[PDB]
Amino acid sequence: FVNEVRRCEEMDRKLRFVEKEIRKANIPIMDTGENPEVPFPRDMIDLEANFEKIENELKEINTNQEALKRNFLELTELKFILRKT
Amino acid sequence: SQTQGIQQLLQAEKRAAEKVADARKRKARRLKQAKEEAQMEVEQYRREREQEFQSKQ
């Protein structure tokens, strides 16, 4: 049953990553409660699959925007070049 | 009590092995039998087709 064990592990790791992202977003939690809301379907597997896909495009846009600001630095260099004559 | 815990296994194992072996030997005999019955029908067709050869002549 170590298959269940390490899939639990990888959901844990993905959740830790998105937690770090939210800490960088400085959005506090609200703790609505309702502690007994854990069901028993196999739908949880493809739900967390959807979620890991979701933060995969989060990583994608992260690299895109840091490279975009990298480019924008040369863009500001270009407009400063335009300023001088 | 604890005795069913092996009787389950033994009955299931017998019911599996018996039918598996049955199918193996059944196929082994059936290939040959299919050949011989096919040949029997074949020679019956030979005979009746000799008959309508004679009628056609």
Binding site: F1, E34 | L9, A12
Partner: protein
């Protein structure tokens, strides 16, 4: 996020308890042996029945009395005004059964 946090926590916990079983050679019914309070076994029966409704497969989910020579663990029912003293007394160790 928090609902999925607690969900995955419960999932790994129950899978660890599943690891804490006896896999029969091929019997589809697991076999376990668990200490149960003598004052709540009927509540446990109700829980087993609840397992039957929440998963409808005509499954019996039986719990049966049996005896052993092994020493049972000791338990104490504390509360708000009894838990701290129980921590105090148990910080030094635990005594034999029915002490």
């Amino acid at each position: 996020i928090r609902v999925w946090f607690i969900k995955v926590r419960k999932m790994k916990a129950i899978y660890h308890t599943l690891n804490l079983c006896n896999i029969d050679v091929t019997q589809k019914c697991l076999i376990a042996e668990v200490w149960c309070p003598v004052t709540d076994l009927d509540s446990i029966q109700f829980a087993l029945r609840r397992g039957t409704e929440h998963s409808g497969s005509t499954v019996p989910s039986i719990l049966n009395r049996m005896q052993t020579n092994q020493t049972p663990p000791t338990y104490n029912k504390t509360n708000k005004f009894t838990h701290g003293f129980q921590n105090i007394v148990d910080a030094y160790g635990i005594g034999t059964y029915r002490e």
